[PDB]
Amino acid sequence: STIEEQAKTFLDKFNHEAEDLFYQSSLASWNYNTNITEENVQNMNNAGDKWSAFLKEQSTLAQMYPLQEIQNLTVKLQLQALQQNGSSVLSEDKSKRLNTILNTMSTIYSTGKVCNPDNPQECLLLEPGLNEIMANSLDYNERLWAWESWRSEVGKQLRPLYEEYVVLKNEMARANHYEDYGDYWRGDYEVNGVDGYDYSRGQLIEDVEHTFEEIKPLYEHLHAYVRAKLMNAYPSYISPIGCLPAHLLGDMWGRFWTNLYSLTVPFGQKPNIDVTDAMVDQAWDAQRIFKEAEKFFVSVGLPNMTQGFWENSMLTDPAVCHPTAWDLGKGDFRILMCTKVTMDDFLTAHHEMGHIQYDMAYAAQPFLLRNGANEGFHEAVGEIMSLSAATPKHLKSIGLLSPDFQEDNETEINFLLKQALTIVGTLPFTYMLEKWRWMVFKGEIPKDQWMKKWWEMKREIVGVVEPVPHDETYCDPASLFHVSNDYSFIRYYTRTLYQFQFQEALCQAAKHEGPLHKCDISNSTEAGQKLFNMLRLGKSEPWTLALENVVGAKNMNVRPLLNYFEPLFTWLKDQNKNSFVGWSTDWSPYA
């Protein structure tokens, strides 16, 4: 049709101009991150401003091509990305109020500090003070003071702002023909017009709930084991049948149970595998780390890094030192990392180069399709690389471990428990938090029980109980960065499931023998081929199809994650055979 042909032409010209402006913005931002200067600040600001204004104009232009008259789905995808009205659908008054609220909540969160009540000029920030307390304190009341002070100082500020934010976001979403803001967020998994691969926004709720039901047994056994350990760590404060008090979970929210490892490690006389000392003994340097990562990716049949990557990357510290993978366009790929010769930075190099490998795979796609299949794909791709790179088999191959090294079962259990505290512990947390936000946006939780329901859900889904009662002046959800800064959260759940799906499939392609957690995909070009068949897609195809390309199934599945942890599950069942498994929601520290 004429309109579709004109849409294709518009998108082609958009692609050329966007490539140019995006490259300049990416290069300016890279320069600032590599060399902090007022001049590079200015150059970054100029590039970003040109890019954003260009996108504003192109959004208006994209409106001239109604999707109702487009029959090509790829064209439809590109047009929809540019046509999103978003906050612009509101009146300037409501738009302005929403932006003021958003910036205010962000500022409240990032300036949050709590001070010693007996000496008010002694104050602590979230990072490092309060985080240090929540990770390392064994003082029930100090931890309670930090947890409660954070919620009281910050969440109470946020409460009225969050109420108005719900109102305005719901108006924005309904004006874009969604049910509410939560439905609007779940649109990020939607698929239409592809027979056999469709995915509705309501289906995400069902699939998250079903997979969570399936992981409930493993989580209950992990929870019971951790509860038994914590009763030893905080005597007289934890009921044998009750939820875990929310302030004893190793960070400010219990998002991860990572920092509980040293309080729960099964076999503390066995250290965990650390090849840092071997790396230093063999005089490794950052370049060596990244060359080994490149070898790993080549071994499955993927390309080695570009000459421009090796020229332009900052793998050494001269700069913002966050590990990051930059896909600037025009064949320009870089990694920014202040690499140290440590096992963690070796694994992180594998992760970031996984990001880069994904980026290279879909570079040939149209501009707007040069992205992950959905919000969870990119980090899952990154994570599986670390999984393979840390296995004892892999470390033996690169000569960082002795050929006769054999991992005993106690070390294996320690490693899987540490993995579960982070990976499994965060799934009930993430599901429950997003479920609360979904229900709030839906209108299913009145304001006057926002907190009452929050904690009811914390007790029921997460097995976690507030150490002190919180009335509706609190906004405990908003005390976490992602809530106050208006980020969807379910990505951390889906990302997790995806990453084990991927791994299992790849490891089956590599004909891996033994427990899944010991698998290494090195030297398996069949595995690299299966992975690449999804990587090259970008987001040109539904995420369901992209997932099927790797793992042979069209939907999220938790069974691979359960398989990965099955040895730990078996061990935990045996450990818990004289303990309660599960929890009563009735007990509280203050009742």
């Binding site: 913005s25 954003s52 501009f367 992205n371």
Partner: peptide, 12 residues
Amino acid sequence: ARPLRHRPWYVS
């Protein structure tokens, strides 16, 4: 702040 290839297109 750096550019994205999807909305919001310019993150911090």
